Design a protein that fits this description.
isomerase (chains A, B); 22% strand; TIM Barrel; 11 helices; 2 domains; Lyase, Ornithine Decarboxylase, Chain A, domain 1; alanine racemase activity (chains A, B); homodimer
């Protein structure tokens, strides 16, 4: 079979979740939207359910997938319902719902539900993605409170620049949130991965760590707390072809890499269709047989090319790590001029193996 | 439900494949590796099988998927077998197998097969990915010919820079291939999408179109033959949130976009996890309600942001095309500094609706 495989360390996943609770002292919703950032929502949720406060996903179809797999922990719909006739399913399956716009408020206020539902009322505090205007926040709360279709209200917002520790925008957003909510008595939720790890003074009854759980740091700089994270995914494959080339030879599509010296070349069973970034330039690090090497030339759809010149006893059948505990995903992401979030989600075709 | 959907035009797929034969006058293997470039390997193959010469995939598992669905047209394993014990499966399901290295030749020569198999002997003619050295080509052919495990031999190779019409590398590769094969009597295969559309005097008994079938052009420049292509995939969603903002307001993560004037902002249910490139900068075109607009700020995992300032009667529930017949995938790919190949493959989560 194709040697390409993604290894998922579930024990590390459990360790990173506990870290979020330990450092913050609050309840934590494990954010597992987009198939748990390509790690597998179903298997990840089963691993955490026994000791987790709940989960958070992007849409109802992701949440339904968890119920069908026997997950009965609380699940939050981070974007809420997209269509009004999703509500009966929300009640049936007891999903926690986010309200980020006044039109969503109108739909709940007008419909007649069999049982009351939890509403996580989202404020736009400076990011300008989804969320209400501060001026409407109090009025929207009082409408939900006097609805009889809502059982509990949680106040939430999201940070635009929490990964930038020098930036004071996070403090500005907190001031906006506190000012907009002050007077109202309810639980609050503000913190994501960066805010959990590096913003200890930010209040949160509920924290929402995503990237954290998967063992990747959201900062450009080193962070004491983020250094304790354990990488979950190990993407690996094997060398299927070895070639010796003289100096001045073009390698791959577009001839974007020409051999500057006589080199030994290896072809790996891994491509951009599997989730490995095509944006990764020549020099991007592997990792083959316990030695750090480099990527060479264009990444093809199913194949990529690495250097084997300085690694004498590596060849056919040698294991190559694309990212994991040895090559951090953040290194590959930063080289391809992107964030680890994306390259995790891009994971495809390869079988996920679970252990720990 | 989440309004995000990918529409697959199977009629256009049939049209694009017929175009490959029509322009080339030869048999065409429909390259449907990577789940048919994200379009769906099974559904595409079914729609083509009746009138297609054969199919090509990256690995045995992609081929086994087709046999399980009932596709019994010829299937070529473009990279051949990765492990020696894949051979009994190859014989059982009658897969055509590529031999790109001598270790694969040793594996077939030593094994005892129930029935003889077709070998597509691949030459490295200058790309330096996978393939034999020109010196070993004639020798490897004779070992396959006198094996009794081999029924038919096709000689193949692949172009590195065929998308560059000004470049003469394709002519050099044909000269190397012809020189290494001359004397030997067998069917040949060389041409991919760019070579089919823009390299008329290149020989091929079998052509291998990939990107072509999905309605996207492999060229930067406009090409007469490539203009006849019909886009297959339409990726679309709806506006879920509408916001009015004054000048000097940051939008999205990292504040990578600040409002230069008072604007009207729209949030679309589509993110980088779905397959949309995060590399797409501010200015990247939609397409909302028949009018061309632009992407604003960073793309989130599940959400992206568009401009609604100049589009007066667009708002909540407005259909947004990310790419398709109105916005070519090449326009988005060239803006995100990549090729249409990658963004097609990145397609995830969204349901694919098959019509035409």
């Amino acid at each position: 079979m194709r040697p390409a495989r993604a290894l998922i360390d579930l024990q590390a996943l459990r360790h990173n979740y506990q870290l979020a609770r330990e450092v913050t002292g609050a309840k934590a919703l494990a954010v597992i939207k987009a198939d748990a950032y390509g790690h597998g929502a179903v298997r990840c949720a089963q691993a955490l359910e026994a000791e987790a406060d709940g989960f958070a996903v992007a849409c109802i179809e992701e949440a339904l997938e968890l119920r069908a797999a026997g997950i009965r922990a609380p699940i939050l719909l981070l974007e809420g319902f997209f269509e009004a006739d999703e509500l009966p399913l929300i009640v049936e399956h007891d999903f926690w719902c986010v309200v980020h716009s006044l039109w969503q408020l109108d739909a709940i206020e007008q419909a007649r539900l069999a049982k009351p539902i939890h509403v996580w009322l989202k404020l736009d505090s400076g990011m300008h993605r989804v969320g209400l205007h501060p001026n409407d926040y109090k009025a929207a709360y009082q409408r939900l409170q006097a609805s009889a279709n809502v059982a509990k209200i949680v106040l939430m917002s999201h940070f635009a620049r929490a990964d930038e520790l020098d930036c004071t925008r996070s403090v500005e957003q907190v001031a906006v949130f506190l000012g907009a909510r002050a007077d109202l008595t309810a639980e609050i939720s503000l913190r994501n991965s960066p805010a959990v790890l590096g913003w200890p003074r930010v209040p949160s009854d509920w924290v929402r760590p995503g990237l954290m759980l998967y063992g990747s740091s959201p900062f450009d700089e080193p962070q004491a707390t983020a250094s304790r994270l354990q990488p979950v995914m190990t993407l690996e494959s094997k060398v299927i072809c070895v070639r010796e080339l003289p100096a001045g030879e073009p390698v791959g599509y577009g001839a974007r890499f020409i051999t500057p010296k006589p080199m030994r070349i290896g072809v790996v069973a891994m491509g951009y269709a599997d989730g490995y970034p095509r944006q990764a330039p020549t020099g991007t690090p592997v990792f083959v047989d316990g030695v750090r090497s480099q990527l060479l030339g264009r990444v093809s759809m199913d194949m990529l090319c690495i250097d084997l010149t300085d690694v004498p006893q590596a060849g056919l059948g040698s294991t190559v790590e694309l990212w994991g505990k040895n090559i951090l995903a953040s290194e590959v992401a930063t080289a391809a001029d992107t964030i680890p979030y994306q390259i995790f989600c891009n994971l495809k075709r390869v079988p996920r193996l679970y252990s720990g």
